[PDB]
Design a protein around this ligand. Sequence first.
Ligand SMILES: [Cl-]
Ligand SMILES: [Cl-]
Ligand SMILES: [Cl-]
Ligand SMILES: [Cl-]
Lengths: 338, 338, 339, 337, 337, 339
Amino acid sequence: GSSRLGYSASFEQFHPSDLLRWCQLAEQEGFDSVLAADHFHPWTPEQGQSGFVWAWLGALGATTRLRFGTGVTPPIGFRYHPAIVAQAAATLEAMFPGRFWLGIGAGEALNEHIVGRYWPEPAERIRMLIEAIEVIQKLFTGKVIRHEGVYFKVESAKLYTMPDVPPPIIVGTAGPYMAKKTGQLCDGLLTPGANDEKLRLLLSRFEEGARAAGKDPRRMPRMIQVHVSWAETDEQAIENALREWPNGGMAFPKGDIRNPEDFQAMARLVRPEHFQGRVLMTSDLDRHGEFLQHLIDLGFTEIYVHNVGRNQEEFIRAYGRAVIPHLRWPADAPVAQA
Amino acid sequence: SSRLGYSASFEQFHPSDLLRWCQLAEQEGFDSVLAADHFHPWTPEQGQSGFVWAWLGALGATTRLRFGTGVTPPIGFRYHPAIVAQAAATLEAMFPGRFWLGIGAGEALNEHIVGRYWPEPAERIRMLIEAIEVIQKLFTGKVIRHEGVYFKVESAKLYTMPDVPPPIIVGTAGPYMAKKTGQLCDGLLTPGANDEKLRLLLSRFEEGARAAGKDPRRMPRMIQVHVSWAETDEQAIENALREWPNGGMAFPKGDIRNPEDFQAMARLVRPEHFQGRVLMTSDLDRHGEFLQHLIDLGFTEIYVHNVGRNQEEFIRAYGRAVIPHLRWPADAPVAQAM
Amino acid sequence: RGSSRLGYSASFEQFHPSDLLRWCQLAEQEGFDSVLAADHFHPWTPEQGQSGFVWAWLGALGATTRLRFGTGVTPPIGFRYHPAIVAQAAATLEAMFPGRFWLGIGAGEALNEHIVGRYWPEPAERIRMLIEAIEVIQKLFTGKVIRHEGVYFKVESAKLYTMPDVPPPIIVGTAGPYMAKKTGQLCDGLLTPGANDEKLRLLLSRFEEGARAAGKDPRRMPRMIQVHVSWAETDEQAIENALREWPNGGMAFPKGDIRNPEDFQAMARLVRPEHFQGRVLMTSDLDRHGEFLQHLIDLGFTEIYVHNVGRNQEEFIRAYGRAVIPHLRWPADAPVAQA
Amino acid sequence: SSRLGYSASFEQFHPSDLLRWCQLAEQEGFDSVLAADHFHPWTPEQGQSGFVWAWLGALGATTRLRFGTGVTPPIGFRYHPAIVAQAAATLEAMFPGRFWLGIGAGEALNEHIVGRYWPEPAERIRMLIEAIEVIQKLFTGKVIRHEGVYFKVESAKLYTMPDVPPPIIVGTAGPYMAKKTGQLCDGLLTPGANDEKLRLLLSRFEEGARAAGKDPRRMPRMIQVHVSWAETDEQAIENALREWPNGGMAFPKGDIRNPEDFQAMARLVRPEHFQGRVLMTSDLDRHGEFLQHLIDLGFTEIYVHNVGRNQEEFIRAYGRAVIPHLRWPADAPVAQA
Amino acid sequence: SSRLGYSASFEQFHPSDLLRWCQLAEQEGFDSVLAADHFHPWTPEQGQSGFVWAWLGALGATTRLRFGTGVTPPIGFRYHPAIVAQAAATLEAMFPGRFWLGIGAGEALNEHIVGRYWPEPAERIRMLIEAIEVIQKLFTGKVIRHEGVYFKVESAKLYTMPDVPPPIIVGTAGPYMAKKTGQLCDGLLTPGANDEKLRLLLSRFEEGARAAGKDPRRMPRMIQVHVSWAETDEQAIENALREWPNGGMAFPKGDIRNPEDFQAMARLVRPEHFQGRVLMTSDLDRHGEFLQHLIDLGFTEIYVHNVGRNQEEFIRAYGRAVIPHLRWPADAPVAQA
Amino acid sequence: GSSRLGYSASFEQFHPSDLLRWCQLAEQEGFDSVLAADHFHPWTPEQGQSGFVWAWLGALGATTRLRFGTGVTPPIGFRYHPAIVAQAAATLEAMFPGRFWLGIGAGEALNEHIVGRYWPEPAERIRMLIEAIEVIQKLFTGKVIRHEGVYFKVESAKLYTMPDVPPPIIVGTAGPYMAKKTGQLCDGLLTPGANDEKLRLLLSRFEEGARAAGKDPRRMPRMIQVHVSWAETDEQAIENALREWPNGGMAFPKGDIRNPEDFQAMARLVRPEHFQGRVLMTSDLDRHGEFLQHLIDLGFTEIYVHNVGRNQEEFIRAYGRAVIPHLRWPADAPVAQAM
Ligand SMILES: [Cl-]
Ligand SMILES: [Cl-]
Ligand SMILES: [Cl-]
Ligand SMILES: [Cl-]
């Protein structure tokens, strides 16, 4: 029924004060939710930012009525111990009930390498993520808990500041295996843009995981984050993607690359063709609308849109005028909340 | 000219209540907030522990108060020093001139949850000094590396960095660390104590600053005090016993792990034990004289924690009868980017 | 029906080892038959002011008396002491003084263990360490070459060549219901501190249930209690002695994480006479000491070790020898901690 | 004037027997005891290894002999240095003027049981030097802390502390450590060896002491020797072969882990291998001359280990025919506070 | 004095084929071989990675070529530095005057298999410098010990040791390590790069050597280049794209773990990306001029890797049309004892 | 069967260039296979060598048609990570198909101590060896594999240079337990010379292990390495053994001894009698022949002979003339080679 769409707040690119103002505008223009990445570093120096997301989310919560979530935090003990992520999530939900969702994932070296520890392969980090989920869920019971596993140790700990109902745990992944585990263990899925076949596989795996654990997946959020480039001309939209988001044209695993300067050098190889299916680059707002509608039709219940250009205000107003009012959402779609 | 600091007790109060009370404190003439960084309360009866970093974002966005952590331990248990640096930089970037980073050696109550060796105080001081080195490197806004006894930092840069870093304030009651604070940091925060102990800490801080070529007359010297105001003396005493028995524990508390431990120790505490540690009276003239004495010793800021649950009434009482009558030196330095 | 006897607690926290040796010799003359010695590195407070190395002192006690004796208790969990070393020490004492030694063990306190600067686990984890240590000690007590690899301890090929025919019993010192049950299941007997009747009955009950579920007969297993008392010429002196000398006795809260004597010293300033209720009997009335001890026998304790908290050790020993010990009635076939 | 040290062999003898024999040794004119700190014997045929610290309490309480460990390794395998310090302080507090703390770099035979990396000798020397630092800090009787390469000590104090600490004696056969012993400690203990090696060790010890401003003429220089006395030469030889084949193993033994290893190596040992390492004879005049020669080299105390099981007969024989005829310098320093 | 080096690409070719081709290269006028020490190829399409140390034994025994590792990482992931030292000493002992030990800071592609913390480049340089210290100690042919930040060596000696050690050559493209190479080692190996970068590396190497009292004019300065020769320009370009896309990746590659990662990154590479990194042409005169230019810059040896699978045809073409026309300075130092 | 015998190339004693020339001669004289030890140090300075075996094997492979193997390599992560041993083995077999066998064992401190790590007891090193076998076998599948166990971690790894059929894994052991495990997990057994009873037990255990895992032990190699001393006179043969191989007369475990200088000092105790049953010392080549034939008759399918004297050329020619032609091998006896 009612108008809605998610806005991606790009901490890699934009000063937190600007993001705050733009989220306030996005709310006025019909966006209903915000996705905020948890980075320490940008992908490139040209992007040039990386605010501490947890502080900013407090400001967002206090000055808007938007829903919001981390997209995503790695609670696997490099930058963040899982107990701290649990406390942070509980505090946000306690302050802003019904508004926060905790998005988590297996992390990238770009952010995690700063603490100077062994960086496991993806499959091992998945195992760490699953153990972290166990820790977070124990703490979310609001009782005194202990934990000893392969990766984490928690001595007697309790979250005294705990909402009546915990925030949902959303896993951000593009892997079939983890998508199934997300359905089994967590409350919802967040995935990046990809071709129809890959998206259907992830949805299917998530649903199968949920059903095998006795859950109803039709009531569970299935969310997607997409990257677009809107501008006044097609040429400007293409140029914006090349300059601002060359990582979008890197169709290869990026989780081991440590430095912004590394991505910067790799970016010199990226060309417009490499953004096919990964960043929609056009001035034609009808085409933005059709792209988003197609994702709803596949079964996504929320979409978070990252415009890669620095023209955030103009993008927000353009989407508010020409895109968001024409999107048709199922009336009973679940959203990430409560 | 009129001013005073308010201590926001995360151990006792829900973060939503603290936010509303800080907004009221601003209206009533308080100009600054001190917020503890806890994971656990001292006792179950206190019953809270919000994630301070998220809350500070909300405070920043809804008030014009100055504010700081009182204090964070950046020594790699709950928090890696690089993360504290990023968090501090983000708050100061969002709220320029308003944040001060208070740090300290930490307590087992909060740090023990991660299940690691807990060093003696003198060793934790060495960890704190190394953490300061890490934070200060990151505050240059350049790519830095670090390898010391306690911390390792791979190539790291704070891209989201204010023009001028927030001040680093050390919270300590030790003469040695007070001197080091003057030498290495921007200001001192200390608890209430007798005149002789306070003069020693001030003196050590000043000597440390002077020997490093700094002018200590321009550097904040801050004190956090605990009081109990209520409508009667009897209610004020009862409030301290029930809410803050840790205030009557004249012994080192940094090794005690569990709220349940403090709870059992609290059964020994009696009114006499609060002498010189918590002022318990309905007489607001006596509150005024106690605070004025501390100003006269040379403290440039005072943060007052009322231990009772009557926060709103306390704030209004201090706003009416105490804050207007305090006499501060004209050019006294406050904790702010200088 | 059984002969007169009672245990004496030698307080290493308070008294020079030479004084303890002389007083134990006197205690033997006065009718005490057994000694309990704590294994500390530090006293609870500076005012207590001592901490001898118990293992050396026990050799002196063994060679100059016919008293039975035990550690009350040693922590064999790899901070100050690797379990293999405790096993060797125990085996040597029993080999030198057959039928006289019992090995009392426990999960330890930071006060003593923190000196080696290692991670100090929570109580539940230290229980797991204690259980593994028991396994190590029992393997070594077979007198064969053994190896061990567990979560906490590694033992390469090791054998106790100096080994009595029959091992000393392993006694666990605990006040926890769970560990009391495990003691019955895994060990040879129980040592517990003085406490109210309800708590003592619960511990005995748990110990007995643990023993029975493992197919053992708990009636043949020692159930020992260490009590803290204050005797003096007046009630007022007895109370003052407890306050000054043993304020830790009035600390009804977990003490296993507190590292320094100076920490307990500062905490002691909060302790008052009321806090000793059920923990330290404070009276000059020796009939009342006699009734208190007899009651503990009647509850089912088979040995009692008495720690007088005052510095008046000689006078205490003579008073108990004259007025208390001859009137105690022990069951005839009560099991004592011995091979 | 008359005196001599008795070595109590924990590797061979039940602690009760050692106690009785030390009491007899005192009656027969021995004035001091050296007791090894082992966990295992060299061979199963030796067959013992009492916990020395407990036994020393019994010795202290039933004799007036001086006594020391010969030696303890305080380098954190079986024993953390803080524990050795406490043990030493307790013995000296109980038996003032009687205990000396002999320490050394240890052997795998005893230390391997805890399942940790066993460093080469030169590295274990560095560990020993750090252990000495820890023990000396604790012997001040104040609250101390320590953090070094090998050891960590949190706030620790020996509350049971004699007025004057026991001397620290290092047992070593290495020139380097002998020099360090003179510099850092109170005296030297070394095994029997040829004249040239002994002179080198004494010289290094003296040079180390002098460079640290100490007077080495007031510092103990002690030697432990192995002998075999019996009624006939043939019995003395047989006793050494059966009881102390390790005495005929002229090779480094500090890495060998098991009694069963030494037992198998023992099958190669023959009488010839004891030349200069174990004196084997019934002739007590020859025992006397051997000991006197060591005094003449400058040793101020000698601890004698008779390798045979005939300890009582050995003690009485030495008491009658050897000890009265030894000539000690009048003011020779002994290991004591 | 016609000569040139052949690069044996273990990433691409079966070791039996490499052996046969090196034998042919010798017949055709190549005088030296460079062999990479990999565990994995850059891509599955390359498809090989023999154990170089075994192969070098075969090369040594069936040719008279000089040869070296280009390069081994002796920094304790795949290889402890003591093992590299022994391997180098054995090859030089078997083939005197023929082996040079090329070492470097390593790549995750090969080292990640052991599952350990992978330090940043600057830290791995520090590890490399310590490894050099270990190798040089072992090359003295005496019993040595070592304890540093990264490596521990207990009493160790190379008993099989040539009279004169093989030279240590460092492979690096970093100015700092180039200077350290001049200071600490015997020569430099660097990849192809623009003139300005090559001059900087040579200059740093020379400055390092001179400050340590060495004469850099007597020290090898070696370069490894990648080329693509084929019958047509089009075939040469296609060969580079298919076989060596890593050659068109102008970005740091030392953290990338899997062949599958490079394979996916390769999809972005185009002919333009090989400019200045892989010379792609059928014109052998142009190959000759490219190599001559590097000699003129001051390189004393060049190792040529042809990226195509047409190795035999490449070797014969270079032997006929390139190698005879190269003009080397008369007394140029080569990597040899 | 056709005439054959194995030659042991003693890296402890001989320069690799000499070993290469002698193996080439051994081939001409009727030896068909070579066993090469993987050492870092010799047992004694008087032996005086230790080439890097992996490089030498490349030279051997390229200049002969002999079979050859390591006797043995320890792939347990001191000198060598198991993944590296796998790669090395795969490369040799790829270059010399049908010719290489990978002999592995639990290793000795003499070689492994140089890296300065904890040296486990034999039983623990067996567990490490079993895990190493798991790693090598995973890599020998020629696919991308991962591994995480108690001792080893392997991230995504693949041997791209891999022969069609892997080289056999041969375990060198004298322990009954490991011999059984070798039959169960590996392709063949290598054992030292020993009395008949011990050899029969090892063969039997190996066979039982193979059969219980569904394998056919009749097709699996059972190999023995023996030490002999041949010379012109018996006296010269004895003198050669004393001077060159005193470790042969050390009937005690040698796996913990770190330094050549240690063995050198221990060697001073060794006498001719100590070589009884361990080194055959005689000029009589008929007696060499009977000794070897007896081992064939026990069921060994290959024998590797180490002559301890420096007279290698003369030994090789003597065996080629007088011993090898007279040995009678079973017709279809399995040899260590890919099958
Ligand atoms: Cl993207
Ligand atoms: Cl307080
Ligand atoms: Cl008590
Ligand atoms: Cl042999």
